[PDB]
Symmetry: D2
């Protein structure tokens, strides 16, 4: 109820699936939260859902705009007098096909922009008000695409989630000297939010297939489980971990099962 008693957090991408569950869970633990996002009304329905303006508020922030990240942070210092936690949770997918041949050049630029520079800007301004307090935890959401590939996950998303781990490792080596921890969380498929762009995509259905394909049975990965991993990294109880890419895939990425399924027996 108060494990994060004290704390002031900013959730970048906080109107979304992992961002709202995380904010909900940081409020349940005693913190003051600022959800930041470009999705206006969804960001407002999320906040005014969870608690009152005294604990959560919404700020518009387009994290590829430095004037907006400057404003998001300076508005959190003016509201709550400090910054303990920054969770940089913005990420977008590609909107061109997977093959390198049909993968767009503009699309590459823009996914690189939202996903990596957007994370650089967030760490830049959080490090501005955390270095003088000589305390802080910056948590980035990377992905299991921060170290593996997948047929169907575009080459710019893999390249961008590797560069997010790249800033995690790099910021960690600069900032641990000011007592600031930098970590990232690498989830597998997080369950929803009821999906159609193509057809197939429906989101009782993507977790059903994520279970087919899962190492680890009997549990569904939901946003609540990533939330618990960044609540650990964010506060409470993780004050000597800064190395970390905290993979939350139930062990999916520890094996490639293609030659074992080609193994089998009984015919």
């Amino acid at each position: 109820t108060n494990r994060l008693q004290d704390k002031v957090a900013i959730i970048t991408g906080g109107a979304g699936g992992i961002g709202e569950t995380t904010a909900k869970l940081f409020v349940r633990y005693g913190a003051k939260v600022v959800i930041a996002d470009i999705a206006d009304d969804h960001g407002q329905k999320v906040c005014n859902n969870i608690g009152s303006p005294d604990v959560i508020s919404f700020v518009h922030c387009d994290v590829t705009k430095d004037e907006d990240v400057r404003n998001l942070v300076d508005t959190t210092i003016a509201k709550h007098g400090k910054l303990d936690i920054m969770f940089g949770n913005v990420g977008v997918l590609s909107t061109t096909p997977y093959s390198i041949l049909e993968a767009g050049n503009e699309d590459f630029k823009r996914v690189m922009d939202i996903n990596v520079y957007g994370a650089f800007l967030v760490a830049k301004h959080a490090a501005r008000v955390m270095i003088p307090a000589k305390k802080g935890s910056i948590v980035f959401t990377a992905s299991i695409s921060s170290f593996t590939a997948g047929e169907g996950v575009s080459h710019v998303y893999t390249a961008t989630k590797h560069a997010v781990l790249g800033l995690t490792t790099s910021l960690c080596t600069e900032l641990g000297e000011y007592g600031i921890r930098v970590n990232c969380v690498s989830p597998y498929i997080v369950a929803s939010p009821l999906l159609t762009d193509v057809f197939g995509v429906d989101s009782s259905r993507v977790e059903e297939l994520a279970h087919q394909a899962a190492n680890l049975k009997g549990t569904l990965l939901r946003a609540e489980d990533v939330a618990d991993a960044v609540a650990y990294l964010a506060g409470d109880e993780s004050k000597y971990v800064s190395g970390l890419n905290l993979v939350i895939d139930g062990g999916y990425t520890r094996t490639n099962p293609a030659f074992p399924t080609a193994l089998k027996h009984g015919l």
Copy 2:
């Protein structure tokens, strides 16, 4: 106070520095704990320190003896009716010099025995009473020597802490199908327990030097911080993570600073 309400845990190596702080912290969180060890009287002073026989008890167990691991587990099922958590925390150092030339062949065998087979045996018997309950978390203590080297850490200790990550990754791929999570924790120097074998070794003093050499300043790594990492992995809040080697080094292993210190400027 009750985050681990329910739980039945076995701490292998539980009379030692990381093992006692962990057991202390699992009792503070509502669990029933069995400390297992070859250090008789220290294991008894640790238990009878923490709480009453109703929550913690001591069992003698030499984890390179399968009859003793069989007995440690069957005695936990007979006392508490189940097994939720197994923390395999036994590890020993080498007692021959570092150079491959002076590194002992008997010593190699025996460190391999305590550190790897001892961990295989613990997972073997815990998996015996966890697979029918189709629930469980096995946590191993590995080390940052599970993926790096160090001048002065013997070649059998590096090779054994890599093989502990090897069983972590391997058991994870077998057991996630019975809903059992397998993880390991990789700490940097954990502070004590007031050390002399050589001279130099004194243990207000090893953390002082671990801070010299540390990425991350202003905090000392103590057994309480590894304890918090295995309490996360053990229960509460980590039920879709099974991939993990949870490094707790404040970012030490993310850089080699030798060519940056050879960089400098001011002469």
Copy 3:
């Protein structure tokens, strides 16, 4: 003399230190080479140095311009009738200070542009003329900053050399199905080319300090040694390796020596 007999290669960044030694070594092995670069006259003195126009030629190509990468590749197909090898060896450093606080936003964009999109564009057009031949090796130069950090290596260079490994792993998973291998080479400090921007930087002198700080003694890392690693990956003898980040650091990144040097003995 003819180990690469047949071969047609493009060296992106080929007027530079690793690019010219590599081209020199692919010509010594029987290949036809196209050096591509924005450094006009240096690219021309490199080519007209090595051999005649029948084996090496220079093309101007600014690898952040797709019309120029389109032209570099189509000019190699028109000259030599095919494309066997693409070595994407362009990389730039940061020109703002290391601290996240003083690290430039424009500089981030531009280093991201040259180093990652520039590599995406090279793989995009090489994959255009390699997929119909269903043969090919794409080699990228990443860095040991593709998986570690360093005080003094800017946060955009770490983030960009992680994203180059990201495209290596991702392109490998797409293109191995057309028989195309994708690899990268991760060198430590490569010796020169006689350096001043600041003072200190002089390049008999940087390898002297790279030896101070080196795992592995008695050898200096020079461009000839990276050249040998990409000649292996490029042809000859590596036709079932596609996973690879081929680290060429003499073991530098396998240890952090800060707590061992804080260890020592004799006082």
Copy 4:
């Protein structure tokens, strides 16, 4: 024909599939080779196949016996006056079932013995005659099981191929200071030698299934391709690489394809 002109090599496990192709290829490159093995007559038919006693000879050596590794090395110094290359290529599989529950305790001990201590002993005696020459390359065969898991690859084989990478990384950090490089090679399924223990196992047939399951199409992984990777590491052209686990899996381990195949489209 003479790329390895000079060289004196020991192939541990050299009567086997990867060991004989490697020895064949080191003789074709100008070296003097000593195949070492417990398979007597097969080791003799391999040697007396390849060339005369002046270049290859067979020594019996059970690499879990230090008196035999002492003898194998001292017999190579007495025959050829030096030691340039040590390739520790012994490995055995498990002979108990995969499940941790049915995995044998004696079998664990013995696979640990052949695979890890056997590699420790080889590096121990090679480092004896290489440190005074202050030159040398020790190459170990690890496996892709040195960093991943597989259903059906026993928990002691994963744990042993991780500990072989553990000694590779550890020996590298000790021995690079005497100018000695330590590397390992991690192959996927190497094609044969015409297999029955169970039925299914036949070895035109295992490469057929290794291709089903392969990243990288159109090539079969054969012992000749691992041979080329250890010839690179062993001599010629790799004299600043010592970090390395040289994966030769055509990219198999860079992806887990289970959720992409659960993705698909057309129904």
